[PDB]
């Protein structure tokens, strides 16, 4: 619906390269989570 809603703590969405995007709100979010690689090497390098 076109009305405001509240949120919660920010997580780090890591699909695109490292953990840089807070969250993708696009309709292809589930698509990129299931198809586009997390590219974890960079993500875990930035984590460490």
């Amino acid at each position: 619906d076109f009305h405001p809603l509240p949120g919660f703590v920010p997580f780090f969405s890591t699909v695109t390269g490292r953990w840089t995007q807070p969250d993708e709100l696009d309709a292809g979010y589930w698509y990129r989570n299931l198809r586009r690689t997390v590219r974890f090497a960079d993500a875990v390098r930035a984590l460490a």
């Binding site: 619906d1 076109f2 009305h3 405001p4 809603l5 509240p6």
Partner: protein
């Protein structure tokens, strides 16, 4: 420690009796003089009356508005205070307080809802609120008793939300209006626990 916890709340119509008991523990009961105060909803409180200690003996004072109606008794072996309602009328619809002293009300119990209303438990008449062109709301008319919580978007919207207090009309029924102030077609729900009347509403200008 000390606790003057009360008991004896309920829903009555004018002309009958009600029980109010104040539990005393953690001190010698015969040393302090029991008093009782009444708190009208939304405005200031008022001393109902008091009883003097047994060692003093004395008498019992009550307010000028409760002469010949309310009596107070006390006992040490069971250490429970007694405030008695007889011939209740409308003004008695208020939360009463158990106070620990004739002139120094040095301790105060939580308070019990003593409600003397001419209505009985019924279902509410929820009425929406059409904006001019703004804020959107929905009235909750003709509900009894208070027990009602009103959320917007079924508990999803929390910013700018209201539950207006209980409204006292002469019929004994109550009114509530919940409103949200944000430009835009919202969902507001009212749940009356005693009547189980679950009302969902859709509002448009």
């Amino acid at each position: 420690e000390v606790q003057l916890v009360q008991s004896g709340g309920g829903l009555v119509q004018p002309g009958r009796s009600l029980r109010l008991s104040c539990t005393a523990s953690g001190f010698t009961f015969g040393d302090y003089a029991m008093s009782w105060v009444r708190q009208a909803p939304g405005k200031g409180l008022e001393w109902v009356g008091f009883i003097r200690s047994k060692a003093y003996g004395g008498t019992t004072e009550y307010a000028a508005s409760v002469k010949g109606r309310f009596t107070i008794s006390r006992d040490d072996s069971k250490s429970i205070a007694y405030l008695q309602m007889n011939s209740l009328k409308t003004e008695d619809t208020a939360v009463y307080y158990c106070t620990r002293g004739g002139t120094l009300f040095d301790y105060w119990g939580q308070g019990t809802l003593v409600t003397v209303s001419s209505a009985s438990t019924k279902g509410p008449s929820v009425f929406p609120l059409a904006p001019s062109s703004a804020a959107l709301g929905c009235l909750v008319k003709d509900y009894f008793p208070e027990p009602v919580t009103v959320s917007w978007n079924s508990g999803a919207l929390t910013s700018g939300v209201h539950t207006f207090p209980a409204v006292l009309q002469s019929s004994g029924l109550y009114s509530l209006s919940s409103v949200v102030t944000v430009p835009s077609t919202y969902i507001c729900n009212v749940n009356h626990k005693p009547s189980n009347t679950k009302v969902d509403k859709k509002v448009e200008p």
